Paper text:
The structure of pili purified from the 8013 strain expressing the SA sequence type was determined in the same fashion to shed light on the impact of sequence variation on the pilus structure (center). Comparison of pili from strains expressing pilin of SA and SB sequence types reveals nearly identical backbone structures except in the C-terminal hypervariable loop. Accordingly, molecular dynamics analysis of the SA pilin shows limited movement in the hypervariable region compared to the SB sequence type. Since mutations of charged amino acids in this area of the SB sequence caused loss of bacterial aggregation, the global change of shape of this loop between the SA and SB sequence types is likely to affect the basis for pilus-pilus adhesion. Interestingly, although the backbone structure is identical, several side chains in the first strand of the beta sheet, close to the alpha-beta loop, are also different between sequence types. Recombination-based amino acid changes had a strong impact on nanobody binding and neither F10 or C24 showed any binding to SA sequence type pili. Structures reveal that clashes come from amino acid differences located in beta sheet strand 1.
Molecular dynamics of the whole pilus with GATDH and G3P for a period of 1µs showed the overall stability of the structure. As previously described, the PilE monomer contains a 4 strand beta-sheet region, and an N-terminal melted alpha helix that forms the core of the type-IV pilus. Immune evasion against antibodies targeting type IV pili is thus attributed to the structural diversity present among strains, including variations in pilin sequence, sugar type, and phosphoform.
Residue numbers in the entry: 1 to 159
Amino acid sequence: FTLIELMIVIAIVGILAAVALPAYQDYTARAQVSEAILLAEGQKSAVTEYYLNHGEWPGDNSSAGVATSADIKGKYVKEVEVKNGVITAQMASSNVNNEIKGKKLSLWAKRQDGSVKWFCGLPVARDDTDSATDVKADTTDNINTKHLPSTCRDDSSAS
Ligand SMILES: *[C@@H]1O[C@H](C)[C@@H](NC(=O)[C@H](O)CO)[C@H](O)[C@H]1NC(C)=O
Ligand SMILES: *OP(=O)(O)OC[C@H](O)CO
């Protein structure tokens, strides 16, 4: 070889040293959001029991029989709230991935003639406590669909 080959080798080493990386931030965000999903999954029992025994959805945390919103906290979850039958979880503002800072996701259920189905995805709000009221969509501090698992990507019109 000659000096040209050595210079080419050095240039190739420099090229390999600085290369672009894929978006692992989305994967880390999904891993962190899984914790909030698990935390919100544990409040289904009280809501279901209240609906079955009273015939209408619970109004707030106190009526359902769970702790206050500011007390249901985890490593990456700030608060979990129940309002008219929907469970919304809000992330924290520090020591959390930048893409899911201050975002929310919601869980809600619909009653059928022989089963009760549960949905998970973007934030959703209900108007009153009636058992047949539909669910609208909320557009305040909404999480992005790229930070959620493929299973938890439901819409407000799902039935
Ligand atoms: C239990 O949840 C109920 C929906 C709520 N009731 C009402 O808001 C209306 O009275 C329904 O006609 C209760 O206030 C809740 N109980 C509490 C907060 O202790
Ligand atoms: O936890 P809670 O349902 O009391 O709500 C906390 C929040 O500050 C009120 O929106």
